[PDB]
Amino acid sequence: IDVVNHGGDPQVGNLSTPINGSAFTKAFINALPAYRKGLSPNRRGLEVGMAHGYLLYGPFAVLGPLRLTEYGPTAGLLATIGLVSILTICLSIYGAVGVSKPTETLTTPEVPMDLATKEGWSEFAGGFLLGGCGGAFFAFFLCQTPHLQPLIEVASNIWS
Amino acid sequence: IDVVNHGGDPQVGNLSTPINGSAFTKAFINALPAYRKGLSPNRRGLEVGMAHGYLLYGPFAVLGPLRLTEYGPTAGLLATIGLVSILTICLSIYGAVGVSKPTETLTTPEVPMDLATKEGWSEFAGGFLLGGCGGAFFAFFLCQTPHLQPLIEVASNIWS
Amino acid sequence: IDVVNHGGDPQVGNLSTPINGSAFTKAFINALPAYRKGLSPNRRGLEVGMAHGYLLYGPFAVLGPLRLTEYGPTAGLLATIGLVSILTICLSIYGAVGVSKPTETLTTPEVPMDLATKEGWSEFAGGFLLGGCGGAFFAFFLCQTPHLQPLIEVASNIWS
Amino acid sequence: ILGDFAASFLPAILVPAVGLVMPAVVMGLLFLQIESEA
Amino acid sequence: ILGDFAASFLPAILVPAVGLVMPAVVMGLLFLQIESEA
Amino acid sequence: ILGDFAASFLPAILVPAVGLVMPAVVMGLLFLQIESEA
Amino acid sequence: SISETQVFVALVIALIPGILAFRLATELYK
Amino acid sequence: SISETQVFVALVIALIPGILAFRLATELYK
Amino acid sequence: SISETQVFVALVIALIPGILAFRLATELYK
Ligand code: CLA
Ligand code: CLA
Ligand code: CLA
Ligand code: CLA
Ligand code: CLA
Ligand SMILES: CC1=C(/C=C/C(C)=C/C=C/C(C)=C/C=C/C=C(C)/C=C/C=C(C)/C=C/C2=C(C)CCCC2(C)C)C(C)(C)CCC1
Ligand SMILES: CC1=C(/C=C/C(C)=C/C=C/C(C)=C/C=C/C=C(C)/C=C/C=C(C)/C=C/C2=C(C)CCCC2(C)C)C(C)(C)CCC1
Ligand SMILES: CC1=C(/C=C/C(C)=C/C=C/C(C)=C/C=C/C=C(C)/C=C/C=C(C)/C=C/C2=C(C)CCCC2(C)C)C(C)(C)CCC1
């Protein structure tokens, strides 16, 4: 029994491995904000930016020049905001150059047609900005309001 | 003089009462963010979410487990953010199932065609997220910055 | 050599002066959020609102009734939020009246077609709201977190 | 400054409502009324 | 209140995960499963 | 650390402008210049 | 002096000409 | 009492029936 | 040492080769 097959077309340079496209990776990649069926841009970008802004307040808050200082969480928030702004500028200029239709693979047989235009990628960039700012500020608020929150004591004792 | 008429079609199960559809309820329901003529989604959702996030920082800020504690306004802000996020997840999955054209009544003879698609309800959900977060944070900032603001002393002396 | 020419059509009431339309003002006005080619509304409005909310936390923070008080930056943030909200209400009612196609000049031979509709101006207004709130809060956070930041000492010693 | 009269918190609510909130509402509503077509 | 048992911080993470996070995930996923057409 | 020279606040503004702001502007503008078609 | 409750009583009494002024103004428009 | 590391060892051991329960449930669906 | 105003004077003097370098670079492009 060949569990590693092609995608239906063998001469295309890809293989349908269990990791690539079997049953659980076709879903949860087609159900991510990118490649989900019903979402518009400025909603895909909102979800992606919220997740990214939330995760990126982890190596700036406890890993920085100010991490031994009470200004450390605020400096990590400002650094996350700056990185999200730089990434939004990158997304905006990537769209402003001109985008093509995204690459269709075995995992994603249907790519979002709304991201194939410059106007869709501008909405994605704006949603990424608002989401990144919101996620970074939400992670800052969650890390700052108990003022110790000993989950942050974990992975800062590691990153001493 | 029959002030309680039908809507023009008697065999439809509704009545055009003064409360339902007379002169002042056809307007101000057709002029709400839902059912307004010129608005797009991610603007209807923005207005609705801003109003909802602002009103929902009333039974969490002064009514909670921390309401006798200085962390009470911050906990109310976090609870409002969590409720807005849960409601946004509900809106997103309601759209992701697939929406039909909204119900046309006597009060609203014209319903928004832009909310009849899955892409429009995704923009509505994203606008609701940004609006709810903004309204909750604005109400938190307004309640927190004078640090007493004796309008909050009203309806907390009631809710003692 | 006539450096001051017409735009190609002399009987139109405008002149193509160096300031108006020569080489450096056709670009950087066609490359502003308004008149840029690839952007959608709720992205033009986002950029415009972010710039406006950032600049408007300059005559409210150090120029106000509370500018000698520690509540001064917070009052300036609240005043910037209020002005951005009033301007968003103005944009929303300007769109809700009904907009025409924007004026085409020598500097801008192509105006955004997406701002020629009521739905586009609603997205612009919502983006202006989110951008203004984000820019005002970002300027508040930047001015507040070092708590002195002696660039603010400049232009407050002037505005003593 | 709150007064010695009964319900002194009502000037702190009604005066910004009648001086800022409802004039903004009335100018917005009258603007939409006088600028709408047909 | 943290316990005297080893890894006392794990009730502070797993109990809100199993009581709030994954039931929300399971109801969202099962809602999308039972309400999708075809 | 501010210096004893005149206008010591100008390194605090120009150095992040020439090291972060205008290189980002120049790379964005040159990226749009070298990647635009026609 | 008058009581605090008398001010709120006079306010909800004043809503009765508040509603009726809105009802007269719309019918004067027609 | 057991150590702190033994709890994390038992958790990553418990991922082995965690994965295999997901694998059985999908094949029981088919 | 030089004064604080002399630094700002030299900066706004330096805008005169700042503008003219931009004017030469665009004409060298053409
Ligand atoms: C036309 C008559 C008149 C006038 C000129 C005033 C003027 C004043 N009142 Mg008011 N008021 C009036 C009627 C009047 N009132 C009556 C009948 C009541 C109900 C019992 C009150 C109850 C009242 C309260 C409780 C308070 C005031 C206060 C105020 C001040 C600011 C306005 C404000 O924010 O509150 C206006 C709030 C209202 C509830 C008034 C509603 C409107 C009234 C009923 C009359 C309608 C006005 C007019 C006829 C319609 C528009 C005409 C147009 C052509 C201009 C100002 C001194 C405030 C104050 O003392 O601040 C220091 C305050 O908090 N008023
Ligand atoms: C079905 C058996 C069973 C039951 C009823 C419980 C019940 C409990 N456990 Mg758990 N647990 C179990 C198995 C079990 N456990 C085993 C085998 C391990 C791995 C060695 C642990 C490891 C463990 C940790 C480390 C912690 C708990 C804790 C908890 C409490 C809250 C649940 C939670 O958040 O953690 C659930 C977290 C897990 C990692 C459990 C994973 C699921 C296990 C392996 C069994 C699967 C359940 C069931 C068979 C499948 C669904 C059946 C469905 C029909 C309902 C509760 C008292 C918490 C506690 O003490 O709070 C005070 C806590 O932090 N558990
Ligand atoms: C090419 C000549 C040269 C070089 C190598 C330097 C280098 C330096 N200057 Mg500058 N500067 C120069 C010209 C020069 N300067 C002149 C003519 C003036 C105007 C009177 C100044 C005014 C000045 C100020 C007021 C400050 C510096 C500072 C700095 C430092 C960081 C750069 C910065 O942020 O400020 C650059 C800011 C400017 C206003 C310079 C504008 C550009 C000048 C005029 C020359 C143009 C460069 C080049 C010819 C064009 C690009 C060539 C390309 C191929 C690389 C660095 C030591 C900072 C410092 O001391 O930090 C510790 C600081 O705050 N400079
Ligand atoms: C009759 C109504 C009235 C009322 C109640 C006020 C109220 C106020 N004025 Mg204003 N003003 C008015 C008429 C009025 N104004 C008119 C007619 C003029 C023109 C001559 C002025 C000229 C004037 C100037 C030029 C300034 C004031 C300022 C102030 C503030 C002083 C409080 C303080 O110490 O700073 C504390 C300030 C704050 C706490 C900021 C309040 C901002 C609020 C909270 C935002 C609300 C957001 C809201 C949702 C949007 C607006 C309402 C919406 C319905 C449209 C206060 C908010 C000063 C100020 O601070 O500006 C805001 C100021 O600089 N006013
Ligand atoms: C078994 C799971 C479980 C867990 C872990 C909790 C946890 C909690 N409950 Mg809840 N609840 C549950 C089941 C549970 N609930 C159910 C089944 C009922 C119905 C009978 C209730 C009824 C109930 C009420 C009515 C109230 C609580 C409140 C609380 C909070 C008390 C903490 C405190 O002192 O205030 C501190 C509070 C906070 C720090 C706010 C936490 C908000 C978080 C941080 C937002 C997270 C955002 C997140 C991304 C979105 C949600 C998760 C997402 C995956 C869907 C805490 C968050 C109280 C509260 O504060 O409400 C929030 C409250 O009023 N609960
Ligand atoms: C599942 C899974 C996975 C994954 C994992 C991960 C990766 C995670 C992450 C996670 C995350 C990463 C999360 C995040 C979250 C986020 C959030 C939660 C956010 C929110 C936010 C908000 C809500 C905000 C708000 C706001 C705004 C918007 C504005 C204003 C301000 C504020 C702040 C209010 C894997 C792959 C392993 C596989 C298996 C399964
Ligand atoms: C009129 C009327 C009525 C109604 C009433 C009510 C219901 C009210 C409510 C009200 C409300 C409920 C209000 C609200 C408001 C809101 C607001 C005012 C908001 C705003 C916000 C903002 C502006 C924010 C901002 C931001 C953002 C966005 C982001 C970042 C951060 C910040 C915070 C900055 C009735 C029915 C009786 C009938 C008669 C008449
Ligand atoms: C260049 C040039 C010019 C101009 C100048 C100016 C006018 C400037 C301004 C500037 C500005 C005016 C800037 C601004 C900036 C802004 C920004 C930088 C913003 C950002 C923001 C953000 C990022 C935020 C965030 C957030 C959100 C969104 C929500 C939540 C919260 C938070 C806060 C996180 C001229 C004409 C002379 C000509 C020559 C050249």
CSV table of N, CA and C in Angstrom, one decimal, chain B residues 17-121:
chain,number,residue,atom,x,y,z
B,17,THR,N,-47.8,48.0,13.4
B,17,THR,CA,-48.2,48.8,14.6
B,17,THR,C,-47.3,50.0,14.7
B,18,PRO,N,-47.7,51.0,15.5
B,18,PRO,CA,-46.9,52.2,15.8
B,18,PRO,C,-45.4,51.9,16.2
B,19,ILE,N,-45.3,50.8,17.0
B,19,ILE,CA,-44.0,50.4,17.5
B,19,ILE,C,-43.2,49.7,16.4
B,20,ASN,N,-43.9,49.0,15.5
B,20,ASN,CA,-43.3,48.2,14.5
B,20,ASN,C,-42.8,49.0,13.4
B,21,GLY,N,-43.6,49.7,12.7
B,21,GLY,CA,-43.2,50.4,11.4
B,21,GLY,C,-43.8,51.7,11.1
B,22,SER,N,-44.1,52.6,12.0
B,22,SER,CA,-45.0,53.7,11.7
B,22,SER,C,-44.3,54.8,11.0
B,23,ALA,N,-43.5,55.6,11.7
B,23,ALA,CA,-42.7,56.7,11.0
B,23,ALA,C,-41.3,56.8,11.6
B,24,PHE,N,-41.2,56.5,12.9
B,24,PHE,CA,-40.0,56.8,13.7
B,24,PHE,C,-39.2,55.5,13.9
B,25,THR,N,-39.8,54.3,13.6
B,25,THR,CA,-39.1,53.1,13.8
B,25,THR,C,-38.6,52.5,12.4
B,26,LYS,N,-39.3,52.9,11.3
B,26,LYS,CA,-38.7,52.6,10.0
B,26,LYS,C,-37.4,53.4,9.8
B,27,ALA,N,-37.3,54.7,10.1
B,27,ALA,CA,-36.1,55.4,10.3
B,27,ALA,C,-35.5,54.9,11.7
B,28,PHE,N,-34.2,55.1,11.9
B,28,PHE,CA,-33.5,54.7,13.1
B,28,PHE,C,-33.4,53.2,13.3
B,29,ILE,N,-34.1,52.4,12.5
B,29,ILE,CA,-33.7,51.0,12.3
B,29,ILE,C,-33.1,50.8,10.9
B,30,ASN,N,-33.7,51.5,9.9
B,30,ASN,CA,-33.0,51.7,8.6
B,30,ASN,C,-31.8,52.6,8.6
B,31,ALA,N,-31.6,53.2,9.8
B,31,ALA,CA,-30.4,54.2,9.9
B,31,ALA,C,-29.4,53.7,10.9
B,32,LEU,N,-29.6,52.5,11.5
B,32,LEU,CA,-28.7,51.8,12.3
B,32,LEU,C,-27.6,51.2,11.4
B,33,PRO,N,-26.4,50.9,12.0
B,33,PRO,CA,-25.3,50.3,11.1
B,33,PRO,C,-25.8,49.1,10.3
B,34,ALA,N,-26.4,48.2,10.9
B,34,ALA,CA,-27.2,47.2,10.2
B,34,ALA,C,-28.4,47.9,9.6
B,35,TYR,N,-28.7,47.7,8.3
B,35,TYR,CA,-29.8,48.2,7.4
B,35,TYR,C,-29.5,49.6,6.9
B,36,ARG,N,-28.4,50.2,7.2
B,36,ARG,CA,-28.1,51.5,6.6
B,36,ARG,C,-27.7,51.3,5.1
B,37,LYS,N,-28.0,52.3,4.3
B,37,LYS,CA,-28.0,52.1,2.8
B,37,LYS,C,-26.6,52.1,2.3
B,38,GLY,N,-25.7,53.0,2.7
B,38,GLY,CA,-24.5,53.2,2.0
B,38,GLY,C,-23.3,52.5,2.6
B,39,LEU,N,-23.4,52.0,3.8
B,39,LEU,CA,-22.3,51.3,4.5
B,39,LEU,C,-21.9,50.0,3.9
B,40,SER,N,-20.7,49.7,3.8
B,40,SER,CA,-20.1,48.4,3.5
B,40,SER,C,-19.9,47.6,4.8
B,41,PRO,N,-19.7,46.3,4.7
B,41,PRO,CA,-19.2,45.5,5.9
B,41,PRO,C,-17.8,45.9,6.1
B,42,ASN,N,-17.4,45.7,7.4
B,42,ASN,CA,-16.1,46.2,8.1
B,42,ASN,C,-16.3,47.7,8.4
B,43,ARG,N,-17.5,48.2,8.2
B,43,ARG,CA,-17.9,49.5,8.7
B,43,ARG,C,-19.2,49.4,9.5
B,44,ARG,N,-20.1,48.6,9.1
B,44,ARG,CA,-21.3,48.2,9.9
B,44,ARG,C,-20.8,47.5,11.1
B,45,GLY,N,-19.9,46.5,10.9
B,45,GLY,CA,-19.3,45.8,12.0
B,45,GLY,C,-18.5,46.6,12.9
B,46,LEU,N,-17.8,47.6,12.4
B,46,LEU,CA,-17.0,48.5,13.2
B,46,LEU,C,-17.9,49.3,14.1
B,47,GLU,N,-19.0,49.9,13.6
B,47,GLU,CA,-19.9,50.7,14.4
B,47,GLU,C,-20.6,49.9,15.5
B,48,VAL,N,-21.1,48.7,15.0
B,48,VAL,CA,-21.8,47.8,16.0
B,48,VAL,C,-20.8,47.3,17.1
B,49,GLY,N,-19.6,46.9,16.7
B,49,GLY,CA,-18.7,46.5,17.7
B,49,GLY,C,-18.2,47.6,18.6
B,50,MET,N,-18.1,48.8,18.1
B,50,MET,CA,-17.7,49.9,19.0
B,50,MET,C,-18.8,50.2,20.0
B,51,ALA,N,-20.0,50.2,19.6
B,51,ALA,CA,-21.1,50.4,20.6
B,51,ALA,C,-21.2,49.2,21.6
B,52,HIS,N,-21.0,48.0,21.1
B,52,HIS,CA,-21.1,46.8,22.0
B,52,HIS,C,-20.0,46.7,23.0
B,53,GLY,N,-18.8,47.0,22.5
B,53,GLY,CA,-17.6,47.0,23.4
B,53,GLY,C,-17.7,48.1,24.4
B,54,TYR,N,-18.3,49.3,24.0
B,54,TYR,CA,-18.4,50.3,25.0
B,54,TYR,C,-19.5,50.0,26.0
B,55,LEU,N,-20.6,49.4,25.6
B,55,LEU,CA,-21.7,49.1,26.6
B,55,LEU,C,-21.3,47.9,27.5
B,56,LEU,N,-20.5,47.0,27.0
B,56,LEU,CA,-20.2,45.8,27.7
B,56,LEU,C,-19.1,46.0,28.8
B,57,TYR,N,-18.5,47.2,28.8
B,57,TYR,CA,-17.6,47.6,30.0
B,57,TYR,C,-18.5,48.3,31.0
B,58,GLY,N,-19.7,47.7,31.3
B,58,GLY,CA,-20.5,48.2,32.4
B,58,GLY,C,-20.8,47.1,33.4
B,59,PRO,N,-21.2,45.9,33.0
B,59,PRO,CA,-21.3,44.8,33.9
B,59,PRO,C,-20.1,44.0,34.1
B,60,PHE,N,-18.9,44.4,33.6
B,60,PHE,CA,-17.7,43.7,34.0
B,60,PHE,C,-16.8,44.5,34.8
B,61,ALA,N,-16.8,45.8,34.6
B,61,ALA,CA,-16.0,46.7,35.4
B,61,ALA,C,-16.4,46.9,36.9
B,62,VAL,N,-17.7,47.1,37.1
B,62,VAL,CA,-18.2,47.3,38.4
B,62,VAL,C,-18.9,46.1,39.0
B,63,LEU,N,-19.0,45.0,38.1
B,63,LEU,CA,-19.6,43.8,38.6
B,63,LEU,C,-18.7,42.6,38.2
B,64,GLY,N,-17.9,42.2,39.2
B,64,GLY,CA,-17.0,41.1,38.9
B,64,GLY,C,-16.4,40.6,40.2
B,65,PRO,N,-15.5,39.6,40.1
B,65,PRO,CA,-14.9,39.1,41.3
B,65,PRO,C,-13.8,40.1,41.8
B,66,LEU,N,-13.4,41.0,41.0
B,66,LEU,CA,-12.3,41.9,41.4
B,66,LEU,C,-12.8,43.4,41.6
B,67,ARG,N,-14.2,43.6,41.7
B,67,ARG,CA,-14.7,44.9,41.7
B,67,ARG,C,-14.4,45.7,43.0
B,68,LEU,N,-14.0,45.1,44.1
B,68,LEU,CA,-13.5,45.8,45.2
B,68,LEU,C,-12.0,46.0,45.2
B,69,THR,N,-11.3,45.6,44.1
B,69,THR,CA,-9.9,45.6,44.0
B,69,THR,C,-9.5,46.6,42.9
B,70,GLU,N,-8.4,47.2,43.0
B,70,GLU,CA,-7.8,48.1,42.0
B,70,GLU,C,-7.6,47.5,40.7
B,71,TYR,N,-7.4,46.2,40.6
B,71,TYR,CA,-7.3,45.4,39.4
B,71,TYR,C,-8.7,45.2,38.7
B,72,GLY,N,-9.8,45.7,39.3
B,72,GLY,CA,-11.1,45.5,38.9
B,72,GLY,C,-11.5,46.1,37.5
B,73,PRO,N,-11.1,47.3,37.2
B,73,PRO,CA,-11.3,47.9,35.9
B,73,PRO,C,-10.4,47.1,34.8
B,74,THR,N,-9.2,46.7,35.2
B,74,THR,CA,-8.4,45.9,34.2
B,74,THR,C,-9.0,44.6,34.0
B,75,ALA,N,-9.5,43.9,35.0
B,75,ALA,CA,-10.1,42.6,34.8
B,75,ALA,C,-11.4,42.8,34.0
B,76,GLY,N,-12.2,43.9,34.2
B,76,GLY,CA,-13.3,44.1,33.4
B,76,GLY,C,-13.0,44.3,32.0
B,77,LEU,N,-11.9,45.0,31.7
B,77,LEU,CA,-11.4,45.2,30.3
B,77,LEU,C,-11.1,43.9,29.7
B,78,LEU,N,-10.3,43.0,30.4
B,78,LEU,CA,-10.0,41.7,29.9
B,78,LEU,C,-11.2,40.8,29.7
B,79,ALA,N,-12.2,40.9,30.6
B,79,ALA,CA,-13.4,40.1,30.4
B,79,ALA,C,-14.2,40.6,29.2
B,80,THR,N,-14.2,41.9,29.0
B,80,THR,CA,-14.9,42.5,27.8
B,80,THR,C,-14.2,42.1,26.5
B,81,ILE,N,-12.9,42.1,26.5
B,81,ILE,CA,-12.1,41.6,25.4
B,81,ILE,C,-12.3,40.2,25.1
B,82,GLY,N,-12.4,39.3,26.2
B,82,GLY,CA,-12.7,37.9,26.0
B,82,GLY,C,-14.1,37.7,25.4
B,83,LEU,N,-15.1,38.4,25.9
B,83,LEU,CA,-16.5,38.3,25.4
B,83,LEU,C,-16.6,38.7,24.0
B,84,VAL,N,-15.9,39.8,23.6
B,84,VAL,CA,-15.9,40.3,22.2
B,84,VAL,C,-15.2,39.3,21.3
B,85,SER,N,-14.1,38.7,21.8
B,85,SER,CA,-13.4,37.6,21.0
B,85,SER,C,-14.3,36.4,20.8
B,86,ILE,N,-15.0,36.0,21.9
B,86,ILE,CA,-15.9,34.8,21.7
B,86,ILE,C,-17.1,35.2,20.8
B,87,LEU,N,-17.6,36.4,20.8
B,87,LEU,CA,-18.7,36.8,19.9
B,87,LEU,C,-18.1,36.9,18.5
B,88,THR,N,-16.9,37.3,18.3
B,88,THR,CA,-16.3,37.4,17.0
B,88,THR,C,-16.1,36.0,16.4
B,89,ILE,N,-15.7,35.0,17.3
B,89,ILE,CA,-15.6,33.6,16.8
B,89,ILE,C,-16.9,33.1,16.4
B,90,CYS,N,-18.0,33.4,17.2
B,90,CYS,CA,-19.4,33.1,16.8
B,90,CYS,C,-19.8,33.7,15.5
B,91,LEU,N,-19.5,34.9,15.3
B,91,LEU,CA,-19.8,35.6,14.0
B,91,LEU,C,-19.1,35.0,12.9
B,92,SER,N,-17.8,34.6,13.1
B,92,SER,CA,-17.0,34.0,12.0
B,92,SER,C,-17.4,32.6,11.7
B,93,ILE,N,-17.8,31.8,12.7
B,93,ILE,CA,-18.3,30.5,12.3
B,93,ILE,C,-19.7,30.5,11.8
B,94,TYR,N,-20.5,31.5,12.1
B,94,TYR,CA,-21.9,31.7,11.5
B,94,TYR,C,-21.7,32.1,10.1
B,95,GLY,N,-20.8,32.9,9.7
B,95,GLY,CA,-20.5,33.2,8.3
B,95,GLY,C,-19.9,32.0,7.6
B,96,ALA,N,-19.0,31.3,8.3
B,96,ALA,CA,-18.3,30.2,7.6
B,96,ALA,C,-19.2,29.0,7.3
B,97,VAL,N,-20.2,28.9,8.1
B,97,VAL,CA,-21.3,27.9,7.7
B,97,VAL,C,-21.9,28.2,6.3
B,98,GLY,N,-22.2,29.5,6.2
B,98,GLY,CA,-22.9,29.9,5.0
B,98,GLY,C,-24.2,30.7,5.3
B,99,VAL,N,-24.3,31.9,4.9
B,99,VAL,CA,-25.4,32.8,5.3
B,99,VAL,C,-26.4,32.9,4.1
B,100,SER,N,-27.6,33.2,4.4
B,100,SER,CA,-28.6,33.5,3.4
B,100,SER,C,-28.9,35.0,3.4
B,101,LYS,N,-29.8,35.4,2.5
B,101,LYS,CA,-30.2,36.8,2.5
B,101,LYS,C,-31.1,37.1,3.7
B,102,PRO,N,-30.8,38.1,4.4
B,102,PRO,CA,-31.4,38.4,5.7
B,102,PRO,C,-32.9,38.7,5.6
B,103,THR,N,-33.7,38.4,6.7
B,103,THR,CA,-35.1,38.5,6.6
B,103,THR,C,-35.6,39.9,6.4
B,104,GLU,N,-36.5,40.0,5.4
B,104,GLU,CA,-37.1,41.3,5.1
B,104,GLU,C,-38.4,41.4,5.8
B,105,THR,N,-38.6,42.5,6.6
B,105,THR,CA,-39.8,42.7,7.4
B,105,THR,C,-40.4,44.0,7.0
B,106,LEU,N,-41.5,44.4,7.7
B,106,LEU,CA,-42.2,45.7,7.5
B,106,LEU,C,-41.3,46.8,7.9
B,107,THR,N,-40.5,46.6,9.0
B,107,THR,CA,-39.6,47.7,9.5
B,107,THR,C,-38.5,47.9,8.5
B,108,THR,N,-38.0,46.8,8.0
B,108,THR,CA,-36.8,46.8,7.1
B,108,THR,C,-37.2,46.2,5.8
B,109,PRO,N,-37.8,46.9,4.8
B,109,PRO,CA,-38.1,46.4,3.5
B,109,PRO,C,-36.9,46.1,2.7
B,110,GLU,N,-35.8,46.8,2.9
B,110,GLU,CA,-34.5,46.5,2.2
B,110,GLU,C,-33.5,46.1,3.3
B,111,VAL,N,-33.0,44.9,3.1
B,111,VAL,CA,-31.9,44.4,4.0
B,111,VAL,C,-30.6,44.5,3.2
B,112,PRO,N,-29.5,44.5,3.9
B,112,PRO,CA,-28.2,44.7,3.2
B,112,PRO,C,-27.8,43.4,2.4
B,113,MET,N,-27.7,43.6,1.1
B,113,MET,CA,-27.3,42.6,0.2
B,113,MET,C,-25.8,42.2,0.4
B,114,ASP,N,-25.0,43.0,1.0
B,114,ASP,CA,-23.6,42.7,1.2
B,114,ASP,C,-23.4,41.8,2.4
B,115,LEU,N,-24.4,41.6,3.3
B,115,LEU,CA,-24.4,40.7,4.4
B,115,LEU,C,-25.0,39.3,4.0
B,116,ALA,N,-25.4,39.2,2.7
B,116,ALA,CA,-26.0,37.9,2.2
B,116,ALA,C,-24.9,36.9,1.7
B,117,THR,N,-23.7,37.3,1.8
B,117,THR,CA,-22.6,36.4,1.3
B,117,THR,C,-21.6,36.1,2.5
B,118,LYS,N,-20.9,35.1,2.3
B,118,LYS,CA,-19.9,34.7,3.3
B,118,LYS,C,-18.8,35.7,3.5
B,119,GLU,N,-18.4,36.3,2.3
B,119,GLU,CA,-17.3,37.3,2.4
B,119,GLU,C,-17.7,38.5,3.1
B,120,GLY,N,-19.0,38.9,2.9
B,120,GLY,CA,-19.5,40.1,3.7
B,120,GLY,C,-19.6,39.9,5.2
B,121,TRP,N,-20.0,38.7,5.6
B,121,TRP,CA,-20.0,38.4,7.0
B,121,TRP,C,-18.7,38.2,7.6
